[PDB]
Amino acid sequence: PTIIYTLTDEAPLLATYAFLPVVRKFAEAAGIDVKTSDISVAARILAEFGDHLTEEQRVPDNLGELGALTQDPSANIIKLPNISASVPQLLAAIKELQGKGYNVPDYPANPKTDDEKKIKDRYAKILGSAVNPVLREGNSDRRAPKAVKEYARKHPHSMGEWSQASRTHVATMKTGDFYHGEKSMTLDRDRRVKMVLKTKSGEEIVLKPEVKLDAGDIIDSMYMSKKALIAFYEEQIEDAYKTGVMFSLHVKATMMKVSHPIVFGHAVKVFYKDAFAKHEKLFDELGVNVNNGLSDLYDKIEALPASQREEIIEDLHKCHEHRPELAMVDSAKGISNFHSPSDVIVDASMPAMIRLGGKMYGADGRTKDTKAVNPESTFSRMYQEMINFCKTHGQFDPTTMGTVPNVGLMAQKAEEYGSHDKTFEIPEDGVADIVDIDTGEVLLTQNVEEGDIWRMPIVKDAPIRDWVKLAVTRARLSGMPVVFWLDTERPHEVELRKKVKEYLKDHDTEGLKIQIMPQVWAMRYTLERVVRGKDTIAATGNILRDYLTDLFPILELGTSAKMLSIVPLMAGGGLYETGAGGSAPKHVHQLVEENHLRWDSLGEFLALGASLEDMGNKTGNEKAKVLAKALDTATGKLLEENKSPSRRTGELDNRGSQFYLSLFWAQALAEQTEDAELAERFKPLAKALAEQEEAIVSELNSVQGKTVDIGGYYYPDPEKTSEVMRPSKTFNTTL
């Protein structure tokens, strides 16, 4: 009977320092041990580079440990939001660890000696989205809990009005992209395959030497034509200019770490083609990679002599005169859409733009309409339908609209999420085949060109079965109809359709509305329903799982940070994500400088409830059920009494809201009558907490408004942090 709580980075971790003690006190009453696990960026640096560390300094491979635990039918993991480290974040975490006596190697951006290549490659394991692929050995059940939905209706968030005369739209490719050249197939038997490029010269380049494929795996051979991509950009940049609408670009270079920077990069290239021509030679040897955005260019020209660097920036701002207006990320500082690929992230930016009435920010500071460019059509057409719907129906009404929960196929690096190590920028014109080693059979041929992006996504049979099961499970349990978003004109989704059609019959689907529709149809059908106050489950692939679980919750609730993210693992256990957003760097900024943490721990409370409830069902622990339901009613009272953390310094913060939760949790257990022992167990505690309420609250608020010492950033001192995060001694002694 063990719950694994994850120690992560920044704000969620700080909240954990105050919350971990109070969850431990409640969980022990059911015989559950709350065991910690450190997956912070620092702990992952240490675990990898234990080469020059003492025994006491060494840490286990906590990620690999948790990854292994997912195979255990009793796994119970609570995953808090964590950093997906960029280079600057990695460097800062390294530098802090070094200064604290941990002998870890520097990260060499450009490895001089060959020994530096090995440790740079070892750091590549730490960079980016590294935690999610390992923990996701199940499929996604993401939905807004009834109590949160009810709260959104009573307290509606602001939403920009949609004008019928709005000019904003999604711009996307009609040919030469992944979708319009896709070939797909379901595997007959186990095979081992290689990815080879037979050039026009006659040479055979092996891009990927070997990949093990199981029976029933779906594989795709999709590519994007570089020539088409640029001609598309030429066209759209021109169109946006001619029509006078603001140009914007929405990709996900954060997670799609290979393909999307190439997509991002090309936009910048063709947009500023006049400047990139004047300085081509200079840019080349400077090693400028604008795939990393303009920020890369600006870095590599900053060291240059003043008269030369100023000439460069002048050729860039001069290029704007024949160009369309650009969407800005920070219009005061002059930071635009093209500055960094990690600024405008498709899953978050598109909802934000729709939420605002189809608006993004201009160079003048004004909001205006935008051509929201999403080059890859596969998953972007669905956004356009909503824009169209809104244009005729107006902005959604949070007080009356329905819900769109999601059942997402993600398990075992599903589809595009596990295709990173299998994506390649093509070196020269040739034919790209995936060939079987045993029997030289080309499984899928594809004619590619120089620059083209080629990848082979993989989705295993077993995950698909669980995914369909979860769809029917959610349908039965909620009474909501469910729609599978599967295109008829996309090979990959016709392959999935064959499977869904079959595996549905393996389940009892007698009293359920379950159908299959292509993306755009499904979106329309879903929109036609939400607007009439009706609910619909979206059973979707991996990338759509990501998009829709940001999109709809932003519209329904105002945020994607207030919802359940349950991962039923295929081996029997459950993983429970508390948040889908970042670890809130700015929240830590406010905590260290003026002792106020505005992090909302609601997602943690909800996940813990879903953790404790599933503990009751799987093991038979009836005392877990009672704690879960009491936390369920404790969380609900937290919302209705309006005691979520304030953003203003000096008011009720994260620590303060943790008190009120634990109070209500204690009260809920004291005044219930389905377990006699637990009732009288919490009775004195509940009586205690309530009695010195405006004494504990008085302490937690008085200590605010000053600089505080946690002893670091990426590795804060457990002793100092705990003092700060538990500053109420009245509260602490009560347990």
Added chain:
Amino acid sequence: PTIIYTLTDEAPLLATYAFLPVVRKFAEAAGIDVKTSDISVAARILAEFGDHLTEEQRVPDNLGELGALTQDPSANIIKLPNISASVPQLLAAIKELQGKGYNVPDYPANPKTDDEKKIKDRYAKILGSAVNPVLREGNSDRRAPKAVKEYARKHPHSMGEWSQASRTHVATMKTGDFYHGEKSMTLDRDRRVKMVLKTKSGEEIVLKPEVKLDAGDIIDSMYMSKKALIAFYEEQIEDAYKTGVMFSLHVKATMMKVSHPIVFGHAVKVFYKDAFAKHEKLFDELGVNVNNGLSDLYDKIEALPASQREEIIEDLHKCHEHRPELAMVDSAKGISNFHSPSDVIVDASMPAMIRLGGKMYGADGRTKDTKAVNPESTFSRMYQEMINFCKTHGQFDPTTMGTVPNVGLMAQKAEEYGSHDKTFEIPEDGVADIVDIDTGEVLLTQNVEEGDIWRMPIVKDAPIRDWVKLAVTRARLSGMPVVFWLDTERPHEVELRKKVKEYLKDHDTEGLKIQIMPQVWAMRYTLERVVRGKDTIAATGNILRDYLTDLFPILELGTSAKMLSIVPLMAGGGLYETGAGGSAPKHVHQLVEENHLRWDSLGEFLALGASLEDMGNKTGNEKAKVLAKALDTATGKLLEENKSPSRRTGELDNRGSQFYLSLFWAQALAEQTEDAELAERFKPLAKALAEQEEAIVSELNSVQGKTVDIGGYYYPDPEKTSEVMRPSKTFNTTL
């Protein structure tokens, strides 16, 4: 990017000489290379007997090459009607080749030495239905093209009227045949079995050493009783006589090379019982085998002294006075039903009889009502339902009736089509068991007699799956319902029924009308529907596929020569049979003697349209689909314009009709509007052919009416033959 076009025998080959140049000129305009494959009777003898040939004389095994090519997903084979060599045909081919300096052995019918036995067996690989078993690695989709049916409505073919007092009927067995003694089962595991006869003496004769069987395969143990068959024969011959109705016998001796001649043989023997008893000893040692018809007896008595020969034939003619009139193949030359087993072929003779109003020819040369004897009741009683139907409803009206396409299970030597090498005339009374060699398990027991025909036909699981999938596909694409003609009382058809019941669930059958009925019922249901202009798909086994795709097309169209015969190959490719009939040797005799080939190449145009149709789907070729649709209208225009070959010499022939088709095809591409490049590409060629119409046709017609030289028959000279098949000056120069 290739289409394999088969070079065959006789008339289709001659047509191909005129056609291959013009199909290549069109197919290169889409990036498709057309390569030939010689599978003629000559090429198949040379391929087998390369021992005595020089290196330059040696030809590749093209038939085996094509057999391997079916396993390739890119396969695209246009198969044309070839010769299924009879002995006299094989002899003539051997002589022709030997005469051309090809050292090939004589075929030894009665091998003296043991070295002669060797090469007779090597020739037995060439004899009979040799191509089809190897090429048919998929199931049959045989149907009338929409453009052909519509021509038959506007121009009906002559049909003989059905009197309600018509005496004609199918006579067939009620016990003792394969049907009423049949045992059948599905295999659970992989095993290897043997065919053994446990005799009365205690001895066990091994009839078949070893045969590998897969899991999920349907196997049958069927036997026809010698005593029951001759009792049947003696009853029906007596019946036909008593009633005064003309006797006729319908079998498939050509393909059923083992069982049917024994069946044919017993008919003749009991019919001529008086002669065969008087001359028993003489006929014994003369070696006369009536399994090969009366012609065999006529050969083996021709050399005998005039007095004795005239005694034998008078005893045969004397036997005719107490027997019924026999049906005549050619009454002028005195050739009857009994002359040769390969003269009256069931699948064509029965439709010919029914189309004629239930009439066949007699001694005087007039049409007469007949007793159409089909000894085996498994697939014959299906004919009797149509006869009855016609007796009450009169003849079919082709101007109003519906279509009956066929989806035929045939893949991988399925059912009775693969039973030849496993069919045995029983040597002595005993039990006939099929036994697993590993373990001693007796799978199917049966009790047989001296002279019985025992066989074990097999059909594999994967072919069945493709068959069912093809039915659903055809239903979905056309809209018309499909009926599985499967009996309840035939064990083989219940094993099939079980699989058809299961494998229909693995498919989307939503808006589709799919049902299983017994043969007799299904026929009646089909007939009741078509008579009021409604369409029905017949999903049937192997023999029924053959029978029905001659029967209805004969009635709907007047001929089974003009129709699509597509074979979706299981590996993903496609085979397109241009004709189910023969190679028409009489057409060749007319061409050599008078320079006029009356061969109809319409089946070749349709199979090419279908070949280009599938080409675009699998690979992605856009220009290929344009060619298919332009051909589909060019073929139609040819029918409408009435420019098909005449049969009278000195008029429009195969060469002429090929011109108009290429003219209509270029013109069809001259005015299309979806590939602007192809429109202007064929624009000069279409204008040239339309400008030279009366010049080209003047040439092709003036060369007729003369004896011409093609340098042989079974192996024609490519130079001389191309000189004959392309005699047009201005037509050729415009390519």
